[PDB]
């Protein structure tokens, strides 16, 4: 059903990189988005996630204060503003999608719809 | 009809507050068009709870709201399919409660499924020490936004020492099927704890809700 296509990937120390992810099929208002990352491996860790109402913004660990997530039901896309990008954040980021929100957001398998992949090189 | 004048409901909850996980099962009943309902909750896992029950009581049913004839009952028309809602309560001392809920209709009874996450309640706060004693009467401001139904409450908790303890609550209600959204109006709610055992593992509640507008 829900289909995802990521954008905004590129190269950047302590900069800005707006990552995006568009959706089609189910209405965005019923889709919860997620973000994961892996650098050369070293475990796909949780970045950020948003609910289907935008009220629930579960973040991760290193992304605290530095990164922020936001959604727009008009353009049907999510945005992950990454600010103060540290060299250790050099990884490939993934955008996943759930439907019915995610009590647990760090479970990749609970996000059925995955996307492609965008590489961030600080 | 679909929503009879007397409807029962069952509720299922899985939540965690400051790390302590728990699960709660409950059954209830009420008159949807009159705006009254009761329920009996039971802590089936993780009991007794190390925090105040009052943060969980507003999560156990706006299908039981008395609406004027000229205000479309958005959450009643959403059935037999149902609706979902998400809630974030920002308490005055930094505590945050996060709720998601699914409402459906199965064999003439409403089915509620709730998932809760409480975080950043101070260890010496009124919540993690059960120094609270019920909610005051609230007025929820309803308004349509982004094709959904949203509400904002300035909720106030009573303290055992005589003080009060506030929280800012925002909730978004979305019907599973497109139905008529109402205008901006208010909902007057009063939630009471009618009975409980010693450690609040068996709690009964009562709620009266009525909508009104100019």
Residue numbers in the entry:
A (entry chain C): 3 to 14, 16 to 125
B (entry chain A): 6 to 65, 69 to 222
What text comes from the article?
Of the various monomeric RFPs, mCherry, developed by Shaner et al., is the most widely used. The identified nanobodies for GFP have demonstrated diverse effects on its fluorescence, such as GFP enhancers and minimizers, which increase or decrease GFP fluorescence intensity. They also identified six llama nanobodies against mCherry (LaMs), namely LaM1, LaM2, LaM3, LaM4, LaM6, and LaM8. We determined the crystal structure of mCherry-LaM1, mCherry-LaM3, and mCherry-LaM8, with resolutions of 2.05 Å, 3.29 Å, and 1.31 Å, respectively. The crystal structures reveal that LaM1, LaM3, and LaM8 bind to different regions on the stave side of the mCherry β-barrel, with LaM1 and LaM3 binding in relative proximity with some steric hindrance.
CDR2 and CDR3 of LaM3 contribute to the main binding affinity to mCherry, while no residue in CDR1 binds to mCherry. Ser21 and Leu124 of mCherry bind to Tyr106 in CDR3 of LaM3, and Arg125 of mCherry binds to the oxygen atom on the backbone of Tyr106 in CDR3 of LaM3 through a hydrogen bond. There are multiple cation–π and π–π interactions between Arg125 of mCherry and an aromatic cage composed of Tyr106, Tyr107, and Tyr108 of LaM3, in which the π–π interaction stabilizes the CDR3, while the cation–π interaction contributes to the affinity between mCherry and LaM3. Ser54, Trp55, and Ser56 in CDR2 of LaM3 bind to Glu94 of mCherry through hydrogen bonds, and Trp55 can reinforce this binding through anion–π interaction with Glu94. Furthermore, there are hydrophobic interactions involved in CDR2, in which Leu58 and Ile59 in CDR2 of LaM3 co-build a hydrophobic environment with Val96 of mCherry. However, there was always a novel peak of 14.30 mL when LaM3 was added, corresponding to the (mCherry-LaM3)2 heterotetramer around 84 kD. The formation of the (mCherry-LaM3)2 heterotetramer was observed in the crystal structure, where specific interactions between the nanobody and mCherry Lys15 and Glu28 were observed. Notably, substituting R130 with I125 disrupts the ion–π interaction between mCherry and LaM3, reducing the binding affinity of LaM3 to DsRed.
